[PDB]
Scaffold this active site. Structure first.
Site, PDB file in Angstrom:
ATOM      1  N   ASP A  82       0.800  -1.218   0.000  1.00 38.31           N
ATOM      2  CA  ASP A  82       0.000   0.000   0.000  1.00 38.31           C
ATOM      3  C   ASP A  82       0.838   1.276   0.000  1.00 38.31           C
ATOM      4  O   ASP A  82       0.337   2.344   0.365  1.00 38.31           O
ATOM      5  CB  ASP A  82      -0.986   0.002   1.174  1.00 38.31           C
ATOM      6  CG  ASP A  82      -1.930  -1.190   1.137  1.00 38.31           C
ATOM      7  OD1 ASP A  82      -2.062  -1.803   0.054  1.00 38.31           O
ATOM      8  OD2 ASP A  82      -2.537  -1.516   2.179  1.00 38.31           O
TER       9      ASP A  82
HETATM   10  N1  LIG Z   1      -4.596   2.453  18.419  1.00 37.67           N
HETATM   11  C1  LIG Z   1      -3.619   1.619  18.085  1.00 37.67           C
HETATM   12  N2  LIG Z   1      -2.938   0.984  19.064  1.00 37.67           N
HETATM   13  C2  LIG Z   1      -1.958   0.141  18.721  1.00 37.67           C
HETATM   14  N3  LIG Z   1      -1.516  -0.188  17.513  1.00 37.67           N
HETATM   15  C3  LIG Z   1      -2.212   0.456  16.566  1.00 37.67           C
HETATM   16  C4  LIG Z   1      -3.244   1.345  16.759  1.00 37.67           C
HETATM   17  N4  LIG Z   1      -3.716   1.797  15.538  1.00 37.67           N
HETATM   18  C5  LIG Z   1      -2.975   1.183  14.649  1.00 37.67           C
HETATM   19  N5  LIG Z   1      -2.043   0.365  15.212  1.00 37.67           N
HETATM   20  C6  LIG Z   1      -1.074  -0.462  14.528  1.00 37.67           C
HETATM   21  O1  LIG Z   1      -0.811   0.147  13.287  1.00 37.67           O
HETATM   22  C7  LIG Z   1      -1.409  -0.636  12.227  1.00 37.67           C
HETATM   23  C8  LIG Z   1      -2.789  -0.105  11.922  1.00 37.67           C
HETATM   24  O2  LIG Z   1      -3.162  -0.462  10.571  1.00 37.67           O
HETATM   25  P1  LIG Z   1      -3.057   0.698   9.477  1.00 37.67           P
HETATM   26  O3  LIG Z   1      -3.532   1.978  10.054  1.00 37.67           O
HETATM   27  O4  LIG Z   1      -1.682   0.705   8.902  1.00 37.67           O
HETATM   28  O5  LIG Z   1      -4.218   0.304   8.439  1.00 37.67           O
HETATM   29  P2  LIG Z   1      -4.554  -0.784   7.321  1.00 37.67           P
HETATM   30  O6  LIG Z   1      -4.760  -2.104   7.969  1.00 37.67           O
HETATM   31  O7  LIG Z   1      -3.467  -0.635   6.258  1.00 37.67           O
HETATM   32  O8  LIG Z   1      -5.938  -0.244   6.731  1.00 37.67           O
HETATM   33  P3  LIG Z   1      -6.645  -0.440   5.304  1.00 37.67           P
HETATM   34  O9  LIG Z   1      -7.650  -1.547   5.454  1.00 37.67           O
HETATM   35  O10 LIG Z   1      -7.264   0.885   4.997  1.00 37.67           O
HETATM   36  O11 LIG Z   1      -5.546  -0.797   4.362  1.00 37.67           O
HETATM   37  C9  LIG Z   1      -1.357  -2.067  12.764  1.00 37.67           C
HETATM   38  O12 LIG Z   1      -0.087  -2.657  12.533  1.00 37.67           O
HETATM   39  C10 LIG Z   1      -1.604  -1.872  14.260  1.00 37.67           C
HETATM   40  O13 LIG Z   1      -0.941  -2.861  15.014  1.00 37.67           O
HETATM   41 MG   LIG Z   2      -2.044   0.430   4.915  1.00 33.69          MG
END
Ligand SMILES: Nc1ncnc2c1ncn2[C@@H]1O[C@H](COP(=O)(O)OP(=O)(O)OP(=O)(O)O)[C@@H](O)[C@H]1O
Ligand SMILES: [Mg+2]
Ligand SMILES: [Mg+2]
Ligand SMILES: [Mg+2]
Ligand SMILES: [Zn+2]
Ligand SMILES: [Zn+2]
Lengths: 125, 1396, 105, 85, 86, 98, 90
Positions: free
Chosen positions: A4
């Site tokens: 991504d």
């Molecule tokens: N509030 C939080 N506390 C702890 N870790 C978090 C928190 N928010 C996110 N993370 C960490 O950061 C990442 C969050 O996922 P991210 O925001 O990168 O989205 P995504 O899964 O890529 O979303 P999409 O489905 O839009 O692609 C994970 O690795 C998670 O462990």
């Molecule tokens: Mg992402």
RNA sequence: AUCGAGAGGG
DNA sequence: CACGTCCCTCTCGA
């Protein structure tokens, strides 16, 4: 572009794509101290560890002057220093300096420093 | 810097906790605190000889301190003091002071009780310090008099029932007396030298008379600093002047004119300051404020930030952080570090002949040149900054200097995302300095850290010594960590681009020509430089996708996988078979090349090595990615389009679903709703309705998957497993589906309606939140909002309910800290207390464990003979001479058939043992040493001749195995105790061994030669001896993460599907919180009671059992109750009546449907009423033939005295059943039991579940299996069946919330926690009281909740900290006895001269 | 051993004979033998010569041993006492048979 | 004081990855402090690779004093500890 | 009749800029007129409304006079201006 | 929301007054067990009236607003199912246009 | 909600007791110069409060911050070319 | 500078 | 009646 992230056309960045302007606004004033003794902006003779030389003798940098690291964008005196150095983390170009006074009449200073940000490997979009 | 001190250097091994005496404070005090003045002789920078540096620390950097001349950096500080004019209760010991005054003669000074009382000599026996002092105060506060004998002892003064107003104590006599500080102090001082010692105290380190402060210790500046800008002291330096102000008032107020009312005020004032000074978050009190509140010393230390975030966790030098981007041209165990970071990050290299030539070049390169250096540290040690030193050029390095030089290519660094919920979330990579300001890491090491390259940020730490270096590269290296103990599987694997293009590549339609083939071959750095003969030659030399891929797979690999219908001549390139590192057939997908339990990664890392597989990762990312570069791959809205008579098909599925749900919608609209048993008509309706949409919407998601060709792009990414799942295709192309908030559907926020665009009381699926449209079609104004509601519910899980799981982990990691396998293979803590006797009850490491099958168990008793039995005395059942070398010369041999019996006899003793341990007949379990693999990796190795016979004797096979087992060591020992736990530890593994080394199998289906065999034996021996866990392994802090990571991490991917709910925050996060805290108020107490042995399949036995425990009362069947006046007056009653008291009638009508719903009549209802009231009530009733079922009772004021009888008769009258058992559901489960032919078979049997837990009574019912019964309330099971029985229920209730989503964690972790609470005696909850109360070291337990409080009762009970727990060493700055610290290292003069 | 039907006078009266262990069980919990249940493993008493052995063979301190409550539904069934140890044989999914030991706290 | 004799040993005879890691490290830190190299430095510079060569030739003059929970121990010499890994 | 819904929006209000000022102005004017009733024993203060009003609009915490401990903190925040829509 | 706006605060007296002038029985003289079937009237959550012919008044007031003689922001409900009439000059109600 | 506070809600809080209350378009009183024609941009750059003025008949009270585009604010009535010349953005 | 307040990021 | 995940980045006010 895996996981991504994305691949950016450097040719298109060079042609101007997603080039940002940036501004910062350092502020300072001549403080009033009871017996009407007040601070003053000026190149001094304590001093900060950075390059005062880019200052003028009114304790200011004039616009259109490149600046880096811990350069002084504002010299002040409370000798006894209160000079305002540049953000230790930015490398800009002075854009516009303002001088007026407070509702107390204090000599009031706002330095503005300009930089163009350029889409780099790692920038978010 | 810090100069050298002659003083010897030691480590801290004991930490003695106690209390100061007022006399010892005066002793150490380097200066009496006389003035409250800041530091103002004349407000000069010269401070005042009264407060701040009267001799303590220094206030000015350019000023040496008045005691130790070292000044500033080196001055520990030096404590002062201020003699209190009046004694003062210690804020923390305030309650502990009272608990004592309640125990001792406030006049005699002796104990209120002594050894002449049965309970005191019992409580006194308790040598547990604090449990005794509690068992004393319990039975001491009562007896309130100084007795004189009662068989003499001792004056007699009655003792006051003491209470506390806040900072002062009072006690009643019969007298309102405000107990004095000195008076209590005078009582405490007179307490028998041995009395207070037996009261949980100490003769030298923690006398009670010191819970009262007669002399206060003043901390030096470094504790309460002062900084300039002019100056301004610290919030506690202020608080001190406040205390001193409050004291100097008392000093003079009491010296001269004693006004008593004022004296008794400025004293209470002073008591206040001394109180808040230590703790300002007190119980009552205003909580002081200075020009505001104020900082209590207790607030400095309160958990999370404050020595838990100053000592358990620090900010550190030699660290970094930036945005991370992914690199397919990097190596797995690498990290692209930006140049700038490598110019700021250094490493103190030591000058030596080995490096001196490299080192001096760097120095000349300086701090600006990439491969340069920053500092040079001499013999004398003062730092020499290479940016400003004049001699920064003509500087000549000496051997033994340190050259703090830039971090260069291939240094070891600690790399980590921040949610460090993983052993894997901190890994060690080789540095690879690169341009641009991003950290760059190999795309396969994303899954461990759970990192994507979207504004993601990663830390970098850098070692400083060559040993912490090796510690990172020999333990925490990324390839060392490729297979996790967490789920005993690979935690890295092919993902994204590489995965998508590797099934695209591994096809038969997929061919590669020569100009493309030579490019691919070159990219493989470990390439044998030999062109593989092309799969197709002559028409046009072509190569198969898999064929070219195989040169990256290392010769020596054998893998075998069979999918759905996968044959030996793969139909749809199904399954997978790699032989000697070349692909035979089958497409490569997630199963083949992912992090699969037995995937390619897993096989390559075990049979080849950690770093070998790592190079494999790159060797594939460099080739596969290259191919995808020139093949390309995209995705548009075209890939979310079925439209072609599959959208004409799907739409129909959602039409009938609106009628199949309309069916039940009209059914219950006319009452005709056959309500399910247990769940009401409404609940029932929705449950059937809710799955008529989810089962239809999920049927349009497979209708979608069908139309979409194999040329679809969204479809392709999911087939490889790149990204995407079954749901995604449905929601995007077919149908979104119902939106679930708090589990249930969209509710009625408006009165009885879901939206102001919808009819009121509308129950349809369109109103209750079903998105009939897909994302392609686009939702409606309504469909969107609901879908927006459901998403939020998710976005809440991913942001609000993460603090539940991050806290359960903190506790886990904190109750399992010190837990590590020890050198006798015991799993102990920091006390030596045995948690387990071999980690995971088999002393194995979780990484070397693999889920292979024990064929000795499941299957037909007939086929068992066929596959294992060898009858040498026989012409039909003997090893045909074509399989052995002596089949005809051993045919009939009987001295040998004795062993073939011994062998075949231990096989059945096996088969019947496994069926004891694995009652359900499941035969695939995890154990070390992949035997299914080893024999294969031996057939390819010795090239086994499926025709020629084997050169093995029956002597060879059965005896080699028998000897192989003796060398499969776990615990090495001598006496029977340990040896007998050897047999145990292995016992199970040996079952698989004897299973797969059956003399029939070895020569019939394995065809092993002798060499091949002996080879298999020796490798098995080692691959086992490798699987033994290593004494040092921090298995506890590991199980904690292994259990806590998936929980915290599952509730972070809840919005990837928006409104889905499922069992994320339904029974997972919730129940698990219950399970850890234990807690009796379980939210769903269920008794899953199994039927009786015999009539388990016939329902009528279950229908009869149902009514025998369902519990019933009068309140259940009753319709209405009416008090009547009648001495014979009721219309419809006058008929039943022709067949002393009181004219007061009690007439209650019953429900016909109700009465027979519980197989009830009237006489039973009556006879119990008569029996609960006996001959003190008159009772009569109608009949079941009657038109009105009625009971009439006469009493035998009485109109309101009868309402008591009704409201007692309703809910407290017990009909049939057992109490608490509120509900009962009958259910038929398919349980697996062995058929008479031996093969396991699926025979159903009836079972009942409850909504209540009275185990002690429901098990004793006739008509069930009291051996199979089960309640999820593990608490009740510990109470009924003993602790050991509970431990299993605890585990079973832990595993049952893990196996749902993220459905695998390895037994060991769960069992350790489980065993953790268990092995105490009862349930020891994972909570600041449950476990934290143990006899652990003081500091340890203070690192988790009740932080300052714990350190208080530690020094008050004169506690001692072992210094054996990790936390202790962490707080002390010492290497913790943890793995690399579990041993000590020494040099024997012998060796040093053996190699002189 | 005495089997009180529904109640027993606290007329306390139990611990009263030095050379005698005065045990008491109720008829209600004895209806079904608890030791027959799926989750309840074999509990074996340890001779004073076995305990003194296991404690030195595992190099243990008495405190360090996993503890079994005095009133444990099984500790009473076997009539355990303070200090008695009980080897426990449970069928584990990793070794097949795993030996544990508990002292009666 | 107490201690264990080398004929009553009972700990796993192989080298614990933590021992190997702390021995390769320990020697590296010592080798990088200009301590005598007991192995044949065959064109080596890195002080870890020297220690890895020293542990491959088992010319490391170190004894691992493995502390068992009861306080007592049993030293194993680096050169006598098997190195399966 | 059902149980009253706690989170039903038509029953929750939105104190906006005006009423916020009202809450501030009143507690202020109430204390200026308390100083007025002390002027008895134009020489009446004026900063009490000037500063006390600046005080809230500056910190964000809603004044509650000056001593506002945990009481309405975060009501006046500086405006985002990285985009127009922002 | 975009259409979303917030109330501001109206004076009730000129609306309480038009209630009495059109069929409100002050609470001081209320006959429960005499005129029981009587929809209750609520000006700003305060009860000081009841009415005989509700639907005729819900329509009478509903056009005062749609005209202007009653402010357009004041929201008014009649719970026919519960025979109640709540009116609001309240400041802080979030209303949309339709 | 600011105006409805201004155009009325003010005189309400007043109830020695005082009469109708008057508000001044925002000005600032600086050290020498007294009445400054204070505008938004002015106070924005100079770091001053956009404070109006409070006067009532029992006499000065204090300074009420005015929100832009409100009642006593100048920009409320002004036009594009007016703001452009006022260094303010349309 | 330190305490407090707030807005973001993963 | 005490806990209430982890880090990281900026803004402002006594
Ligand atoms: N509030 C939080 N506390 C702890 N870790 C978090 C928190 N928010 C996110 N993370 C960490 O950061 C990442 C969050 O996922 P991210 O925001 O990168 O989205 P995504 O899964 O890529 O979303 P999409 O489905 O839009 O692609 C994970 O690795 C998670 O462990
Ligand atoms: Mg992402
Ligand atoms: Mg991310
Ligand atoms: Mg996010
Ligand atoms: Zn000193
Ligand atoms: Zn006495």
């Amino acid at each position: 572009n895996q996981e991504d992230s994305m691949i950016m056309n450097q040719s298109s960045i060079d042609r101007g794509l997603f080039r940002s302007l940036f501004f910062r606004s350092y502020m300072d004033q001549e403080k009033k101290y009871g017996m009407s003794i007040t601070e003053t902006f000026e190149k001094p003779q304590r001093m900060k560890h950075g390059t005062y030389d880019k200052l003028d003798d009114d304790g200011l940098i004039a616009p259109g002057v490149r600046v880096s690291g811990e350069d002084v964008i504002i010299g002040k005196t409370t000798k006894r220093d209160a000079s305002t150095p540049l953000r230790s983390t930015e490398n800009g170009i002075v854009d516009q300096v303002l001088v007026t006074t407070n509702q107390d009449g204090l000599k009031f200073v706002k330095v503005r420093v300009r930089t163009t940000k350029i889409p780099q490997i790692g920038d978010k979009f | 810097g810090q100069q050298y001190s002659s003083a010897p250097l030691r480590t801290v091994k004991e930490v003695q906790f106690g209390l100061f005496s007022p006399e010892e404070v005066r002793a150490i005090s380097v200066a009496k605190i006389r003035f409250p003045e800041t530091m103002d002789e004349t407000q000069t920078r010269a401070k005042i000889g009264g407060l701040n540096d009267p001799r303590l620390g220094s206030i000015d950097r350019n000023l040496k301190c008045q005691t130790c001349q070292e000044g500033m950096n080196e001055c520990p500080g030096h404590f002062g003091h201020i003699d209190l004019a009046k004694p003062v209760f210690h804020v923390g010991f305030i309650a502990k002071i009272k608990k004592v005054c309640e125990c001792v003669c406030m006049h005699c000074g002796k104990l209120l009780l002594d050894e002449h009382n049965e309970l005191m000599r019992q409580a006194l026996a308790i040598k547990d310090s604090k449990k005794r002092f509690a068992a004393i105060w319990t039975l001491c506060k009562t007896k309130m008099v100084c007795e004189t004998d009662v068989p003499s002892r001792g004056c007699g003064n009655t003792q006051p029932t003491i209470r506390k107003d806040g900072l002062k104590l009072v006690g009643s006599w019969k007298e309102l007396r405000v107990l004095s500080t000195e008076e209590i102090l005078n009582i405490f001082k007179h307490i028998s030298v041995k009395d207070f010692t037996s009261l949980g105290f100490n003769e030298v380190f923690s006398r009670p008379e010191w819970m009262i402060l007669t002399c206060l210790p003043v901390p030096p500046p470094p504790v309460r600093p002062s900084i300039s800008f002019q100056r301004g002291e610290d919030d506690l330096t202020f608080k001190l002047a406040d205390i001193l102000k409050a004291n100097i008032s008392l000093e003079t107020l009491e010296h001269n004119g004693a006004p008593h009312h004022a004296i008794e005020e400025a004293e209470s004032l002073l008591q206040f300051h001394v109180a808040t000074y230590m703790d300002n978050d007190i119980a009552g009190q205003p909580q002081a404020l200075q020009k505001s509140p104020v900082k209590s010393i207790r607030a400095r230390l309160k958990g999370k930030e404050g020595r838990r975030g100053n000592l358990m966790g620090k900010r550190v030098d030699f660290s970094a952080r930036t945005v991370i981007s992914g690199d397919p041209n990097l190596e797995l165990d690498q990290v692209g570090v930006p140049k700038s970071i490598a110019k700021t990050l250094t490493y103190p290299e030591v000058v030596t002949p080995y490096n001196i030539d490299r080192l001096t070049q760097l120095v000349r390169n300086g701090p600006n040149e990439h491969p340069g250096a920053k500092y040079v540290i001499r013999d004398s040690g003062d730092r020499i900054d290479l940016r400003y030193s004049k001699r920064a050029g003509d500087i000549q390095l000496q051997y033994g200097w340190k050259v703090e030089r830039h971090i260069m290519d291939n240094d070891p660094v600690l790399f980590n995302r921040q949610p460090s919920l993983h052993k894997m979330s901190m890994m060690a990579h080789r540095v690879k300095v690169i341009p641009y300001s991003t950290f760059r890491l190999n795309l396969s090491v994303t899954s461990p850290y759970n990192a994507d390259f979207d504004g993601d940020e990663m830390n970098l730490h850098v070692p400083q010594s060559e040993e912490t270096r090796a510690e990172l590269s020999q333990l925490c290296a990324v390839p060392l960590q490729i297979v996790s103990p967490q789920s005993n599987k690979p935690c890295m694997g092919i993902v994204q681009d590489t995965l998508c293009g590797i099934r695209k590549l591994t096809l038969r339609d997929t061919f590669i020509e020569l100009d493309q083939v030579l490019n691919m071959l070159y990219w493989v750095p470990d390439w044998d430089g030999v062109i593989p003969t092309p799969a197709i030659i002559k028409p046009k030399p072509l190569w198969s996708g898999k064929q070219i891929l195989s040169v990256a797979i290392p010769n020596g690999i054998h893998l075998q996988r069979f999918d759905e219908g996968t044959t030996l001549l793969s139909p749809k390139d199904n399954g997978m078979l790699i032989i000697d590192g070349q692909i035979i057939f089958g497409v490569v997908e997630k199963k083949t090349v992912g992090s699969s339990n037995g995937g390619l990664i897993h096989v390559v890392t075990r049979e080849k090595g950690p770093q070998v597989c790592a190079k494999l990762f790159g060797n594939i990312q460099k080739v596969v990615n290259f191919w995808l570069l020139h093949n390309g791959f995209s995705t548009g809205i075209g890939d979310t389009i079925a439209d072609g008579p599959t959208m004409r098909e799907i739409t129909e599925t959602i039409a009938e679903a609106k009628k199949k749900v309309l069916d039940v919608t009209k059914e219950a609209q006319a009452n005709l709703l056959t309500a399910k048993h247990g769940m009401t008509l409404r609940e029932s309706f929705e449950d059937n309705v809710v799955r008529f949409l989810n089962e239809a919407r999920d049927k349009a998601g497979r209708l979608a998957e069908v139309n979409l060709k194999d040329l679809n792009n969204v479809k392709q990414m999911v087939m490889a497993g790149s990204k995407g799942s079954f749901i995604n295709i449905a929601q995007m192309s077919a149908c979104v589906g119902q939106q679930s908030v708090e589990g249930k559907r969209i509710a009625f926020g408006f009165v009885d309606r879901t939206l102001p665009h919808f009819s009121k009381d509308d129950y349809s699926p369109e109103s209750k939140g079903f998105v009939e449209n897909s994302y392609l079609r686009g939702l409606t104004p309504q469909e969107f909002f609901f879908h927006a509601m459901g998403g939020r519910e998710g976005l809440i899980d991913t942001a609000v309910k993460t603090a539940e799981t991050g806290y359960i982990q903190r506790r886990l990691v904190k109750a399992l800290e010190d837990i590590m396998v020890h050198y006798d293979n015991t799993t102990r803590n920091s006390l030596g207390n045995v948690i387990q006797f071999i980690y995971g009850e088999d002393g194995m490491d979780a990484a070397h464990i693999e889920k292979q099958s024990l064929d000795t168990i499941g299957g037909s008793d007939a086929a068992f003979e066929k596959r294992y039995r060898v009858d040498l005395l026989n012409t039909d059942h003997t090893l045909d001479p074509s399989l052995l070398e002596s089949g005809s010369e051993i045919l009939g041999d009987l001295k040998l058939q004795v062993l073939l019996d011994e062998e075949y006899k231990q096989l059945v003793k096996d088969r019947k043992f496994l069926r004891e341990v694995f009652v359900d007949g499941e035969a695939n379990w995890p154990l070390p040493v992949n035997i299914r693999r080893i024999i294969q990796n031996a057939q390819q190795t010795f090239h086994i001749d499926h025709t020629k016979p084997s050169d093995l004797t029956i002597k060879d096979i059965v005896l080699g195995v028998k000897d192989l087992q003796e060398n499969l060591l776990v615990l090495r020992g001598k006496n029977e105790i340990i040896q007998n736990a050897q047999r145990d530890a292995v016992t199970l593994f040996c079952c698989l061994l004897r299973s797969r080394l059956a003399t029939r199998r070895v020569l019939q289906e394995y065809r092993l030669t002798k060499q091949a065999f002996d080879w298999v034996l020796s490798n098995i021996e080692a691959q086992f001896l490798r699987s033994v866990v290593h004494p040092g392994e921090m298995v506890g802090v590991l199980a904690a993460q292994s259990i806590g990571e998936p929980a915290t991490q599952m509730t972070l991917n809840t919005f990837h599907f928006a409104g889905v709910a499922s069992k994320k925050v339904t029974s997972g996060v919730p129940r698990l919180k219950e399970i850890l805290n234990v807690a009796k108020n379980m939210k769903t107490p269920s008794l899953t009671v199994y039927l009786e042995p015999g009539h388990a399949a016939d329902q009528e036995q279950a229908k009869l059992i149902r009514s025998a425990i369902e519990h019933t009362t009068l309140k259940s069947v009753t319709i209405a109750s009416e008090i009547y006046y009648d001495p014979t007056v009721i219309p419809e009653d006058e008929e039943i009546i022709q067949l002393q008291q009181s004219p007061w009638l009690l007439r209650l009508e019953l429900d016909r449907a109700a009465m027979n719903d519980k197989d009830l009549t009237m006489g039973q209802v009556g006879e119990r009423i008569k029996q609960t009231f006996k001959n003190d009530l008159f009772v009569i009733w109608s009949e079941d033939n009657d038109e009105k079922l009625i009971i009439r009772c006469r009493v035998v004021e009485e109109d309101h005295m009868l309402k008591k009888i009704e409201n007692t008769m309703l809910e407290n009258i017990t009909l049939r059943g057992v109490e608490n058992i509120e509900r009962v559901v009958m259910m038929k489960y398919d349980r697996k039991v062995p058929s008479p032919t031996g093969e396991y078979v699926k025979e159903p049997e009836w079972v009942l579940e409850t909504d209540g837990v009275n185990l002690s009574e429901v098990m004793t019912v006739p008509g069930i299996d009291p051996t199979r019964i089960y309640t999820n309330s593990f608490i009740d099971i510990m109470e009924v069946l003993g602790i050991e029985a509970g431990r299993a229920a605890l585990y079973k209730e832990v595993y049952n919330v893990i196996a749902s989503d993220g459905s695998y964690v390895n037994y060991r972790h769960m069992a350790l926690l489980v065993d953790v609470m268990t092995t105490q005696g009862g349930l020891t909850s994972v909570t600041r009281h449950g476990f934290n109360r143990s006899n652990t070291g003081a500091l340890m337990r203070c690192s988790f909740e009740e932080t300052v409080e714990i350190l208080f009762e530690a020094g008050a009970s004169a506690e001692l900290d072992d210094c054996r727990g990790v936390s202790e060493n962490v707080i002390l700055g010492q290497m913790a006895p943890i793995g690399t610290g579990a041993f000590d290292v020494m040099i024997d003069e012998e060796s040093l001269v053996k190699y002189m | 051993i005495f089997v009180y039907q529904n109640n027993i006078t606290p007329s306390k009266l139990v611990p009263s004979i030095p050379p005698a262990t005065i045990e008491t069980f109720n008829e209600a919990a004895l209806v079904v033998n608890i030791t027959h249940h799926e989750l309840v493993p074999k509990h074996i008493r340890l001779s004073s010569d076995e305990k003194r052995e296991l404690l030195k063979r595992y190099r243990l301190k008495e405190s360090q041993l996993p503890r079994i409550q005095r009133a444990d539904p099984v500790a009473l069934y076997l009539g355990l006492k303070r200090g008695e140890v009980v080897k426990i044989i449970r069928k584990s999914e990793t070794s097949g048979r795993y030996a544990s030991y508990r002292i009666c706290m | 004081e107490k201690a264990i004799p080398k004929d009553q040993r009972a700990t796993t005879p192989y080298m614990t990855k933590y021992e190997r890691a702390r021995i390769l490290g320990t020697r590296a830190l010592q080798i990088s402090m200009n301590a005598p190299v007991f192995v044949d430095l065959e064109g080596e510079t890195d002080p870890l690779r020297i220690a890895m060569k020293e542990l491959a030739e088992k010319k490391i003059p170190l004894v691992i004093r493995r502390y068992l929970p009861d306080g007592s121990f049993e030293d194993w010499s680096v050169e006598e500890l098997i190195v399966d890994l | 009749k059902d149980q009253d819904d706690r989170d039903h929006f038509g029953k929750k209000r939105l104190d906006l800029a005006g009423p916020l000022l009202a809450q501030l102005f009143k507690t202020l004017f109430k204390k200026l007129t308390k100083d007025i009733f002390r002027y008895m024993q134009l020489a009446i203060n004026a900063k009490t409304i000037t500063s006390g009003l600046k005080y809230a609009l500056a910190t964000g915490n809603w004044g509650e006079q000056k001593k506002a401990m945990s009481s309405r903190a975060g009501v006046s925040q500086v405006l985002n201006r990285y985009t127009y829509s922002s | 929301s975009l259409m979303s706006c917030i109330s501001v605060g109206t004076d009730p007296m000129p609306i309480i007054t038009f209630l009495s002038e059109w069929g409100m029985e002050p609470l001081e003289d209320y006959v429960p067990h005499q005129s029981p079937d009587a929809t209750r009237v609520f000006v700003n959550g305060v009860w000081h009236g009841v009415h005989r012919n509700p639907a005729r008044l819900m329509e009478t007031l509903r056009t005062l607003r749609r005209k202007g003689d009653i402010n357009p922001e004041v929201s008014m409900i009649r719970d026919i199912r519960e025979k109640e009439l709540k009116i609001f000059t309240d400041a802080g109600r979030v209303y949309r246009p339709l | 909600s600011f105006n409805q506070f201004v155009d009325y809600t003010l005189q309400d809080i007043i109830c020695i007791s005082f009469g109708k209350i008057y508000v001044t378009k925002p000005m600032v009183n600086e050290s020498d110069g007294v009445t400054h024609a204070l505008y938004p941009q002015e106070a924005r750059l100079r770091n001053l409060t956009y404070s109006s003025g409070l006067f009532v008949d029992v006499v000065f009270i204090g300074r009420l911050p005015i929100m832009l585009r409100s009642k006593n604010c100048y920009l409320s009535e002004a036009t594009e070319s007016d703001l452009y010349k006022l260094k303010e953005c349309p």
